[PDB]
Amino acid sequence: METTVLVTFEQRLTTGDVGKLSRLIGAVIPIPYRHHLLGSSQVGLDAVVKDKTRDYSRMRARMREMTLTIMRRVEGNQMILGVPTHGQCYTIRNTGPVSWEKGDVLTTLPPVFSGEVTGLVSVSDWDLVLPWIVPMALATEINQRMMMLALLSLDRSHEEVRAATAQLRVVRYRDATLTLRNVCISLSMIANLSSEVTLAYVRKLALEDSNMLLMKCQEITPTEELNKLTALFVMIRQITDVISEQPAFLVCDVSPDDKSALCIYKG
Amino acid sequence: VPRVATGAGIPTSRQTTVMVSKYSEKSPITIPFEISAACLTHLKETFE
Amino acid sequence: SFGPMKREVMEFDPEDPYKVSKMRKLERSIAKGYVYGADHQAITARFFVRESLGEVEQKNLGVLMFRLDTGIEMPSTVLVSLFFLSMVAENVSAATKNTLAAIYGREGEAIRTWLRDGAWRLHRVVHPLGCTNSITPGATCLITCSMRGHSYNMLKTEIYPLLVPKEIYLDLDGESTDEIRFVYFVITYDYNSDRQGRPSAFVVVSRITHRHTLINVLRYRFRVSRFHFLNNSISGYGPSTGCLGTLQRLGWFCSRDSRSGIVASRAGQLSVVKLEKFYVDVGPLVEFA
């Protein structure tokens, strides 16, 4: 019926491992790029989870490039996938740590190994590590905790600041508790430079005030002047690239045992 | 299993189908009995 | 020979986008009698709704449903109508607020006054779920809620409209024309004293499709809230608030069909705006300030 992506099992999938793939019939699949044949080494997110110096946001910058795809059926030597048509309903499988509820917007995130390190049907270093289809309001929440832990990561030498971090990685949502760098440089370039460059621009604009809002906005070298504002706006572009989490689903109703949920596919 | 459902809003089930299997339990019997070596000798020795 | 003769068969299935959906539905409608729910490009879902939530939506048909993230773990997901959160917003007249506070409030609701007005709107408790068709009154109300597409009777007999109440609509009714008309949904806060304000809700229609040109026509309307948004930025140092406004796509309709109406309910009637050919189409949240 729909779009088709076949996955050629370069590794030998034992019938018991097929028994685990035949349980994940609904589950999402991160595909690197839309093509009809892909290897099992392509299919999945393990090629993203792999570097000595690889940061959470950089993986999220990679996964945002990866096309979401949905498992259709596992026929032995092959995995059949469907790139989901936008706007249609899809039975995706709740392989995240969070129970879904009727009406919620679901966002793909890379799985975090903080207290919930997980693998799959692995043989020869390839498992099928599966992205946390997490609710959208918690997806922004998880992002904010990761940056604030990293903004406080330099001041480990204070125990009180370390006790501020000790509360911080405790993430608690409906029926679920889980534990959790240039992006924080990007946070700090906006925090410091907007403090200094706006003062010559508030006092000039505050005379004429159409929406009547510049009045309490005041209450709140031209080459180097633009050089600040260039490296102001481009760092604002860099953080907004890794903030707007591009929502992926809308669960209409949840199948019982919370394994699956019919989800109309959005974005 | 048979099916039945009813009414409006009354929670209807989905079609149950059960497959079960009953395993074997084994007790083997064995019984000895004595024959003398003198007894079996008369079958063999077979006098005048 | 062999190869190309097989590929003619997979080629010459023309004149349809697949002819896989249409043909294979017929071979199961010949099998099972004429099947409903199959000639339906729009998209629905059946939801378990209690009797204390069953009202309005039951009687007059075609209206929004909203999920709650109520901060209590056991009933954490309460269905909310667009009629229902009129007892939260500042826009709604207190008679119009207490008209529908007396419809819902009969001994199965008024927690949800106290855990929406009290447990404030963070504009993340509400989720645009969709619009209704074909309520099932019985032991449990069982609402078929449409997701993408129009709300309509089965048998394609009548387009169910969107029942927008009047107070939430005319404070952001758009301009007058005869085109297609997108329905957006806007929550605006007036940050004055009580950590969220009295979180004001809006059903806004506009010919405008684009994002920041749409929030600019909100930058006309909401200076009273926007100047208060700047106020708590300096009225509280350390404490901060959040968003000023919150925009999301909710659907569209045909804009010659925009006409007023009324629902005929318990605790008096309620003046509404009836948007006839309402294609439900939920969009993403646009948090702005």
Relative to beta strand C80-81, strand A260-265 is unpaired
3-class state of residue C124 by DSSP: coil
| Residues constituting chain C | 289
**Helix and strand counts by DSSP (H, E) for chain A:** 8, 12
DSSP tag of C135: -
The CA distance from C240 to C228, in Å, is 13
- Please report how many Cα atoms fall inside a 13 Å half-sphere around the Cα of residue C284, on the Cβ side: 18
Tokens of residue A7, six digits: 């996955």
Resolution, expressed in angstroms to one decimal: 5.0
The neighbour count for residue A191, using CB atoms within 10 Å, is 10
3-class state of residue A259 by DSSP: coil
CB contact under 8 A, A216 and C20: no
Tokens of residue A122, six digits: 């692995």
The CA distance from A206 to A201, in Å, is 8
Contacts 24+ apart (CB under 8 A), C236-242: C241/C189, C241/C191, C241/C195, C241/C196, C242/C122, C242/C189, C242/C196
The CA distance from A28 to A90, in Å, is 10
Substitution target in A3, A177, A213 with the highest count of C β-carbons within 10 Å is A213
- Please report how many Cα atoms fall inside a 13 Å half-sphere around the Cα of residue B22, on the Cβ side: 1
Handedness of CA C267, C272, C277, C279 (dihedral sign): negative
The CA distance from C242 to C279, in Å, is 31
Tokens of residue A88, six digits: 């249609």
Find all residues with CB under 8 Å of C237, minimum gap 6, and list them: none
CB contact under 8 A, C137 and B10: no
CA C125 vs CA A55, C80, C129, C253: distances in Å: 31, 10, 12, 26
The CA distance from C72 to C78, in Å, is 11
CB contact under 8 A, C138 and B10: yes
Q: Which helix (H) or strand (E) holds A232?
A: helix A222-241
The CA distance from A46 to A42, in Å, is 9
Which C residues 133-162 touch A at CB under 8 Å?
A: 145, 147-148
* Cβ neighbourhood burial of B48 (10 Å; 0-12, 13-18, 19+): exposed
CB contact under 8 A, C43 and A213: no
The CA distance from A29 to A70, in Å, is 5
Q: What are the residues facing A81 on neighbouring strands?
A: A5, A71
Dmax (CA) of chain A: 75
Distance in Å from the first CA to the final CA of chain C: 68
Relative to beta strand A37-39, strand A5-8 is parallel
Find all residues with CB under 8 Å of C180, minimum gap 6, and list them: C207, C252, C253, C254, C255
The CA distance from C231 to C196, in Å, is 13
Q: Which helix (H) or strand (E) holds A186?
A: helix A182-197
The CA distance from C204 to C183, in Å, is 6
Please tell me if residue C118 touches chain B, with a CB cutoff of 8 Å.
Answer: no
Dmax (CA) of chain B: 102
Please tell me if residue C289 touches chain A, with a CB cutoff of 8 Å.
Answer: no
The neighbour count for residue B29, using CB atoms within 10 Å, is 4
Way the structure was solved: cryo-EM
Substitution target in C51, C52, C134, C140 with the highest count of B β-carbons within 10 Å is C140
